[PDB]
Design a protein around this ligand. Structure first.
Ligand SMILES: *[C@@H]1O[C@H](CO)[C@@H](O)[C@H](O)[C@H]1NC(C)=O
Ligand SMILES: *[C@@H]1O[C@H](CO)[C@@H](O)[C@H](O)[C@H]1NC(C)=O
Ligand SMILES: *[C@@H]1O[C@H](CO)[C@@H](O)[C@H](O)[C@H]1NC(C)=O
Ligand SMILES: [Ca+2]
Lengths: 123, 324
């Protein structure tokens, strides 16, 4: 008999391109361009969706095998680029308070949006 | 936006540094157009060679060295690490394309190099390269008028400045351009003033000063009279890069452009052309105005069979490489 608390779905995008999607499927994909790791911007209406996450493989000292990533955490009209070891902010739209929060969780940058928490190992 | 992280080279040997300077330099050898030279380990080394096509000033060869990658663009061809490659060529962090009218080499987190193929060439650099670069594009310290032209506390002329950033071949001894005598012509008909100060670049007057561009337009008028629109094109690029919205200035007489049947030639069109393979790419883009061919609103591009811009509900689908 288990408590009936809901549990957060988990996607994992790591390594040379291994992905473990939300539904538990596993596969490997070696992509070099920018790839939508997630979004609500897919539906009969795209505009009732909120966020969007793109990633691509940075080489950190050459143009060869991948060495790190580059994340683009869009949240509504905000934006956060995760590269090179820390974050940025290119907020362009309406300038309200952040719909996100930023934290240094161990060896991770963790960015929350009250229902959607992204953890980046910084590499 | 790309406020002061841009340098450019256009028309009759006109060089614009990161911080806003403009000067003419009629060099004709290889030059260090920009280079990471105030760091323990260099990240980029982009060089230009400027030559003559009959009489037209052109760029004949670019050699971008970055992070162990060598990229030699010349003769309408691209050499990647010594091997010819067919456009577009993409790898982790690097992509080179024939996008639009140009050849664009983007080395992600390093640089963005546009090369129109004959005369123009534009560099976008990361903000982290401030104060650590040196070359015709300047130092990227943000101060235009004070720090590019002081070689050990002495002020130089643009001829001397461009001659400092010179680099001979292993077996080549290229001379220096002797100073051009006085000019003539100026803007007698007023075309440069009428266009540049006209309606199109109105808000561009609020971001980029046109004085040097007016002078360059007049100087190009002194040259051939089918080649005065290079300065207007460059001003459009710069105004778009600062953030402002350039407006269409081209008229069937002012260097007319042509595009395919369903594609219109626009100044300041959205860079991410929606195409029913990804018909909503242009939703949350971040990139300023870009010139080129575009589609009338509503009918996204058809990149699946290249039938021009097509209505959303009449363009094919793709399954496993099969067209439907
Ligand atoms: C959502 O899409 C449907 C068609 O699928 C359309 O009829 C409706 O107006 C759209 N709603 C909004 C808010 O865009
Ligand atoms: C460019 O290369 C072609 C061969 O690919 C050659 O015929 C031509 O002379 C070269 N130069 C120009 C300006 O086309
Ligand atoms: C830029 O570099 C010069 C060279 O010595 C230095 O004096 C200056 O403090 C630097 N400024 C910035 C903002 O990097
Ligand atoms: Ca300076």
């Amino acid at each position: 008999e288990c408590s009936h608390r809901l549990c957060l779905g988990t996607c994992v995008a790591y390594g040379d391109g291994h992905f473990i999607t939300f539904d538990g499927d596993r596969y490997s994909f070696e992509g070099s361009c920018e790839y939508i790791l997630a979004q609500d911007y897919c539906g009969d209406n795209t505009t009732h969706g909120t966020f969007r996450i793109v990633t691509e493989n940075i080489p950190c000292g050459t143009t060869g095998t991948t060495c790190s990533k580059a994340i683009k955490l869009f949240v509504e009209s905000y934006e956060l680029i995760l590269q090179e070891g820390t974050f940025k902010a290119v907020a362009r739209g309406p300038g309200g308070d952040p719909p996100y929060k930023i934290r240094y969780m161990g060896i991770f940058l963790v960015i929350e949006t009250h229902g959607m928490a992204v953890s980046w190992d910084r590499k | 936006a790309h406020n002061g992280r841009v340098c450019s080279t256009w028309g009759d040997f006109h060089y614009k540094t990161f911080d806003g300077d403009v000067f003419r330099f009629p060099g004709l050898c290889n030059y260090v157009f920009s280079e990471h030279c105030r760091a323990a380990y260099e990240d980029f080394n982009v060089q230009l060679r400027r030559g003559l096509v009959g009489s037209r000033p052109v760029v004949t060869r670019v050699v971008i060295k970055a992070q162990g990658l060598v990229l030699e663009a010349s003769n309408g061809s691209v050499l990647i690490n010594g091997q010819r490659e067919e456009l577009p060529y993409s790898r982790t962090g690097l992509l080179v394309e024939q996008s639009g009218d140009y050849i664009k080499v983007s080395i992600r987190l390093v640089l963005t190099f546009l090369w129109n193929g004959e005369d123009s060439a534009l560099l976008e650099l990361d903000p982290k390269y401030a104060n650590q670069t040196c070359g015709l594009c300047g130092d990227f310290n943000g101060l235009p008028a004070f720090n590019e032209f002081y070689a050990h506390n002495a002020r130089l002329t643009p001829l001397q400045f461009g001659n400092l950033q010179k680099l001979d071949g292993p077996t080549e001894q290229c001379p220096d351009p002797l100073p051009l005598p006085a000019g003539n012509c100026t803007d007698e008909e007023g075309i440069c003033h009428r266009t540049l100060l006209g309606p199109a670049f109105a808000e561009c007057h609020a971001l980029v000063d046109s004085t040097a561009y007016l002078a360059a337009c007049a100087q190009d008028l002194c040259r051939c009279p089918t080649c005065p629109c290079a300065t207007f094109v460059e001003y459009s690029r710069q105004c778009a890069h600062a953030g402002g919205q350039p407006r269409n200035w081209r008229c069937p007489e002012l260097c007319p452009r042509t595009c395919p049947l369903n594609m219109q030639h626009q100044e300041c069109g959205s860079p991410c052309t929606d195409t029913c393979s990804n018909p909503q790419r242009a939703q949350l883009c971040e990139d300023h105005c870009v010139d080129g061919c575009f589609c009338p609103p509503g009918t996204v591009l058809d990149d699946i069979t290249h039938s021009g811009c097509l209505p959303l509900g009449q363009c094919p689908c793709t399954h496993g490489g099969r067209t439907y």
